């Protein structure tokens, strides 16, 4: 699947993009079967495993669980593994798919996000992680080729929309937050420049608003000063689309503003006594720096960030219980 | 020896030995040139010893030096890569250049188109100059020969190991052997190296 793919590199770089796109369909039909090949035995070994009794195997369960032997089913795990030669090759093909990549901008960038979200949610969150670093590099180095590739034809803007989803889903689902949010932040920052290249498209910025709106949940989960950045970025980039798209959501928009008021100030005192000894100014800098990424460079305070939403006439536009509250 | 320091190879020489590729040799087994071989490459290509190159570059020059004439030193190059070089050797040393065919009989043959009276012969390749080497052996003529790791050695007096075939390894030694004699006898005196580059040397390479 790779030695033949090395032909499929050079043989199908011969301008039959009927053949190129159909093999991208086959590149899913690569993984469409061997996803199920595990997914049958996900039941079918566990058909046998439940048919096996653990009461008799309890000292072997001591040999299992006190060892943490963790009885995974390699019937799946190896039929899990063989579409990675089918998966990762197409990602490895992708940086070399220059001068049009439009069989793949339509499909494979999103078909990677199709295939990744299956196998990440199935087993492979660490094989997700480096691959998203790989994709971001095979986003970047493919652009750094610059062999007839641009963003302003909305080529990289759905490549964004795939890869941003590839970041934001695993983060929320279950991932280490320090690393893939940087894979999101390096996606969001560069593609803010690619939006700046592609004449800022407000609907992927509405998706970026949603990427903020995702993060407003997450930065009430992870960092209030980022939430100071993102909920202020949630509302105004929506309030731009209240002007740009003329949103007639006068119940929701009156209730997304109270959503934008109440959560936005609440920044209590830090509890980290070691981190003051361990140089807090580096941390607040990163709290500043990824707020410079979002465009709200200094992380705003409790009260003056309310007063941004107060002075702007959307505090008037609150569904008035919160306004009274 | 003369000024012993630059007579023990300077990096100007050392780079030029690498630049002309003189250190390389053939692939053939020797029994008289394997002493002059430094090492061999993977599956055999012989790195010759440039120490053996230089020490024979000194003494074969010293055989020419204290002959009061370069006229009875007939230097020989049937190879066209050395024909510019022996032109620039005879330009520098003043020796007698022999380009191309020996015309068998210049050393024998009373009745002949020519007759030469040398004392020492200098040879690019004793296989390419065997017809000099025959009439060297006929009338008691010693012969310096530039020998690679595939060269013949019969009737061959003091031999300077070089790659000395094809490349600028030919014209570097004629740059160097005219260096060594003007080092000994000349205006490049007192064992100083040349200020003349081997670009007055290396062979013509038909131009644009």
């Amino acid at each position: 699947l790779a030695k033949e793919g090395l032909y499929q590199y050079k043989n199908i770089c011969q301008q039959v993009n009927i053949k190129s796109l159909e093999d991208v369909v086959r590149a899913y039909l690569k993984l469409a079967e061997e996803k199920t090949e595990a997914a049958k035995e996900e039941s079918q070994q566990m058909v046998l495993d439940i048919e096996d009794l653990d009461n008799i195997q309890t000292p072997e369960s001591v040999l299992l669980s006190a060892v943490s032997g963790e009885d995974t089913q390699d019937r799946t795990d190896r039929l899990l593994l063989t579409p990675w030669v089918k998966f990762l090759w197409e990602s490895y093909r992708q940086c070399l798919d220059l001068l049009r990549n439009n069989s793949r901008v339509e499909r494979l960038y999103h078909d990677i996000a199709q295939q990744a979200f299956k196998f990440c949610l199935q087993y492979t969150r660490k094989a997700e992680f480096r691959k998203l670093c790989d994709n971001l590099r095979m986003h970047l180095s493919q652009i750094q080729r610059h062999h007839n590739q641009s963003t302003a034809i909305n080529l990289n803007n759905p490549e964004s929309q795939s890869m941003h989803l590839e970041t934001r889903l695993v983060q929320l689902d279950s991932a280490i937050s320090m690393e893939l949010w940087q894979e999101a932040f390096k996606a969001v920052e560069d593609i803010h420049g690619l939006f700046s290249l592609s004449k800022k498209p407000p609907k992927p910025q509405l998706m970026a608003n949603y990427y903020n709106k995702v993060s407003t949940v997450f930065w009430k989960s992870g960092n209030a000063l980022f939430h100071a950045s993102t909920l202020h970025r949630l509302y105004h980039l929506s309030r731009e689309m209240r002007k740009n798209l003329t949103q007639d959501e006068m119940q929701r928009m009156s209730t997304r503003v109270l959503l934008a008021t109440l959560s936005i100030p609440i920044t209590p005192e830090r509890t980290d006594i070691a981190r003051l000894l361990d140089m807090d100014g580096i941390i607040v800098e990163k709290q500043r720096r990824l707020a410079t990424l979002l465009g709200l460079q200094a992380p705003p305070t409790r009260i003056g960030l309310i007063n941004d939403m107060v002075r702007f006439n959307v505090l008037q536009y609150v569904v008035p219980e919160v306004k009274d509250l | 020896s003369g000024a012993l320091d630059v007579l023990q190879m300077k990096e100007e020489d050392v780079l030029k030995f690498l630049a002309a590729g003189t250190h390389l040799g053939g692939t053939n087994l020797d029994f008289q040139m394997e002493q002059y071989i430094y090492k061999r490459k993977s599956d055999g290509i012989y790195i010759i010893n440039l120490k053996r190159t230089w020490e024979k570059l000194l003494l074969a020059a010293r055989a020419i030096v204290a002959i009061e004439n370069p006229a009875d030193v007939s230097v020989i190059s049937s190879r066209n890569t050395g024909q510019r070089a022996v032109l620039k050797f005879a330009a520098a040393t003043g020796a007698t250049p022999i380009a191309g065919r020996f015309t068998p009989g210049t050393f024998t043959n009373q009745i002949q188109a020519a007759f030469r009276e040398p004392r020492l012969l200098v040879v690019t390749d004793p296989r390419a100059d065997h017809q000099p080497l025959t009439e060297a052996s006929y009338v008691n003529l010693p012969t310096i020969a530039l020998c690679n790791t595939d060269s013949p050695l019969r009737y061959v007096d003091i031999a300077i190991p070089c790659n000395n075939k094809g490349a600028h390894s030919v014209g570097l030694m004629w740059w160097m052997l005219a260096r060594e004699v003007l080092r000994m006898r000349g205006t490049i005196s007192r064992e100083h190296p040349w200020e003349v580059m081997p670009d007055l040397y290396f062979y013509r390479d038909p131009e644009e």
């Binding site: 000292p59 040999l63 009885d71 280490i176 960092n223 509890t271 006594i273 070691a274 580096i282 | -």
Partner: protein, 557 residues
């Protein structure tokens, strides 16, 4: 088939297997099968039944030598052919005793004293059991962890351990005491990775209506004959001084003292036998077993809930990144140090089976959490603008790799559960640590590893409650000038004899200026002052000023 007569050709047909091995080229499939042909053709009995005894002695030698011949690492079915016939030879031997060993009971077909040495062939039968054990050692090592068939091969260990009983019970203790280096170690070999889980089914199964027959009073004693024979041959490894195995046994005794017994013994026997030095000269794969042992000391430091000893048994281990290779599983390009593959082949043909692998994520949650409840009230004294004991290269520095993470959302990694609980520890709320540890180590099955883990949790319940009470007092110290004992007994859910052991040691050992009326249950502190903490912060500075000024004259004179 070969020859249709009795004994005489059959020994020559026996020796022809024994002879044909010693060649630069030798196939050994025919050498095995003809021995079974000589089993059935020896239909005569003790003219031929004794011939089977050396045939079963030579089947295993033919079965063993058959697989460093093609591959590799013997097939376990070929090993189960060894497991079958070692059982079968002992089945012969239990019916045999000292017949065809002969010993002039009869001579033909008898006498293992005929060539040669009637105990040695019996002793090499025990060395054939080694051949069953050595490939099974490879079978435990060279079989995949995620493979559920690895559990299937591991089930045959008790069948080996049955023979470890069956040999030494048929022994005739010539084989016991001469091989007390090994035959005793064969009793260790089924003990020193074994569990308290069966001991919970042995000892903590109540003997009121279960262990009433002599069935649970013979097999359970055999489960503790192994913890007996180790102490029985402590004193025989006084004799069998065997420091490659003696130091190795005592560390496995310390395993039995930590796990299979009470860890107070394991703390003593490390101090007793002084195995800081013997491990070097005696085969540094036993240093790996030594590093396996002090890990399991820290396990039973954690099983007994001792956090300092969980830090201090992880002192020869967790002051270094060696602990990966202390199970023999480090990678070559993991650093610029691990070279090379061939030495990696030596170390990993050697080490280690997966049931002999252990949970390092537990070990990090052993190492990090144990100093987390220690160093945070310790540093809360330091971070109260009063520090002189800032210890470099500590869990403080193991916190630093997890500390500066501003992006860190939910705790999901093992360090992330520590660092979240560390911040919950810094808040002084004990309850918030329990969400970050106990549930998440059940999420990562790390709590799900011990039977003692409910106690270990309950031990670490109070280690969170008592010490976050200290960070409650350490952080809110300037304005607390009257401190209750009735409230704090109700707040942090801690009874008074603990609280009196807390608050006195909060007053005595921390040396806080604090009046205390334990009849009134009232702490009165009055620290005075927080702006004069800067006077303490300047006396942090100017006292350093006087020292190196003195040290300016100390070096120069």
């Amino acid at each position: 088939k070969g020859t249709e007569i009795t004994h005489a050709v059959v020994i020559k047909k026996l020796n022809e297997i024994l002879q044909a091995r010693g060649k630069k080229g030798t196939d050994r499939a025919a050498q095995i099968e003809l021995l079974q042909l000589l089993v059935q053709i020896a239909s005569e009995n003790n003219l031929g039944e004794g011939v089977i005894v050396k045939i079963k002695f030579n089947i295993i030698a033919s079965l063993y030598d058959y697989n460093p011949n093609l591959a590799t690492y013997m097939k376990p079915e070929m090993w189960q052919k060894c497991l079958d016939c070692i059982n079968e030879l002992m089945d012969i031997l239990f019916a045999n005793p000292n017949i065809f060993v002969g010993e002039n009971i009869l001579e033909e077909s008898e006498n293992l004293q005929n060539v040669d040495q009637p105990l040695r062939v019996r002793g090499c039968i025990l060395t054939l059991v080694e051949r069953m054990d050595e490939e099974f050692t490879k079978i435990m090592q060279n079989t995949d962890p995620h493979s559920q068939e690895y559990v299937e091969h591991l089930k045959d260990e008790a069948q080996v351990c049955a023979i470890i009983e069956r040999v030494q019970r048929y022994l005739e203790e010539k084989g016991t005491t001469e091989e007390i280096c090994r035959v005793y170690l064969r009793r260790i070999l089924h003990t020193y990775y074994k569990f308290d889980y069966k001991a919970h089914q042995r000892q903590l199964t109540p003997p009121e209506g279960s262990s009433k027959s002599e069935q649970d009073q013979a097999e359970n004693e055999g489960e503790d004959s192994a913890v007996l024979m180790e102490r029985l041959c402590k004193y025989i490894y006084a004799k069998d001084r065997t420091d490659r195995i003696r130091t190795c046994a005592i560390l496995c005794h310390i395993y039995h003292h930590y796990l299979h017994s009470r860890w107070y013994q394991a703390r003593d026997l490390m101090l007793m036998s002084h195995l800081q030095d013997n491990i070097q000269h005696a085969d540094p794969p036993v240093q790996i077993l030594y590093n396996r042992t002090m890990v399991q000391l820290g396990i039973c430091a954690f099983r007994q809930g001792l956090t300092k000893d969980a830090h201090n048994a992880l002192l020869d281990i967790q002051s270094s990144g060696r602990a990966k290779e202390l199970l023999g599983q480090g990678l070559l390009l993991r650093s610029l140090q691990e070279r090379n593959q061939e030495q990696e082949k030596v170390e990993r043909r050697r080490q280690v089976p997966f049931h002999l692998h252990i949970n390092l994520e537990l070990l990090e949650c052993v190492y990090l959490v144990s100093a987390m409840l220690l160093e945070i009230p310790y540093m809360a004294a330091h971070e109260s603008d009063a520090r002189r004991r800032m210890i470099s290269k500590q869990f403080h520095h193991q916190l630093r790799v997890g500390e500066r993470q501003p992006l860190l959302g939910p705790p999901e990694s093992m360090r992330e559960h520590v660092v979240a609980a560390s911040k919950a520890m810094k808040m002084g709320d004990w309850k918030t640590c329990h969400s970050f540890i106990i549930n998440e180590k059940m999420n990562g099955k790390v709590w799900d590893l011990f039977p003692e883990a409910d106690k270990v949790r309950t031990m670490l319940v109070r280690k969170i409650q008592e010490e976050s009470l200290r960070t409650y007092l350490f952080t809110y110290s300037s304005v607390y000038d009257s401190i209750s004992m009735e409230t704090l007994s109700d707040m942090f859910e801690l009874d008074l004899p603990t609280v009196h052991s807390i608050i006195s040691k909060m007053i005595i050992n921390e040396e806080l200026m604090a009046s205390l009326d334990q009849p009134t249950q009232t702490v009165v502190m009055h620290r005075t002052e927080p702006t004069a903490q800067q006077n303490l912060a300047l006396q942090l500075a100017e006292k350093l000023g006087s020292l190196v000024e003195n040290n300016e004259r100390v070096f120069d004179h």
